[PDB]
């Protein structure tokens with residue numbers, strides 16, 4: 524019922540697991556734990572996740588309930604009530620400094636850098652040539668990707684599942700969870716992800732799976748869900764995707780030594796299709 528995940532930490536040369544077999548298990552499973560740097564403050568983000576849905580009466584973050592997608596010219600952004608228990612506030616990096624509270628934008632920038640370092644370590648381990656990283660990652664091997672800082676609240680009063688079974692769209696997801704509910708389907712059995720408030724949960728998205736499908740050890744996008752919540756639950760995540768601007772899409776690529784990078788689809792196209800798959 525409970526999954527046992529490999530634990531890593533960011534070191535001087537990148538991702539440090541206990542050994543090479545632990546990294547090989549972690550990358551093949553598509554999910555692992557990443558120790559949270561002692562200097563990285565998560566307390567403002569935790570409070571934002573507990574508050575964003577409550578409206579302007581609740582300070583300092585309740586007012587973000589009133590910011591819908593029309594405010595951003597991007598239908599994916601802002602407050603969203605989902606068909607599951609989940610309600611969300613999603614915002615891409617181009618809007619953080621202007622729209623998010625100053626300390627929330629700061630959290631997003633720091634998570635972008637941690638995710639940047641995690642991704643470059645992964646691309647090296649997958650055997651992708653370094654000179655192809657920028658195009659292969661749609662900019663995420665540097666800081667030119669699309670990055671969403673997304674806050675999640677599970678309304679326990681709503682029936683049925685917390686968040687439907689799915690895979691993330693992008694390359695790297697850095698997930699901050701302090702309560703039970705997350706479940707992963709490694710192999711073919713659903714398993715609870717253990718709670719560890721000292722670690723992020725890291726997993727790969729669909730773009731990573733597509734990118735590394737022909738590699739020596741292909742990396743998969745883990746299927747995961749949030750079980751029905753009988754009490755309220757909150758969380759937040761940092762998502763790294765190939766640059767998917769409404770007018771500036773970087774596309775999704777498969778790497779093959781015999782051919783280089785072959786375009787598969789567009790980045791926003793993958794996101795819109797996935798959101799349609801996730802919520803039936």
Ligand SMILES: CC[C@H](C)[C@@H]1NC(=O)/C(=C/[C@@](C)(O)CO)NC1=O
Pocket residue numbers: 599611613671672673689690691692693762764794801
């Ligand atoms: C790349 C932009 C998207 C919106 C980003 N990637 C995801 O896979 C996503 C999935 C859900 C389950 O959280 C949305 O319901 N969340 C995000 O923030």
Ligand SMILES: O=C(O)CCC(=O)C(=O)O
Pocket residue numbers: 673675686691698700704705747749757758759760
């Ligand atoms: O809330 C969680 O623990 C998981 C949320 C999630 O998987 C997502 O928002 O994509």
Ligand SMILES: [Fe+2]
Pocket residue numbers: 689690691747
């Ligand atoms: Fe997810």
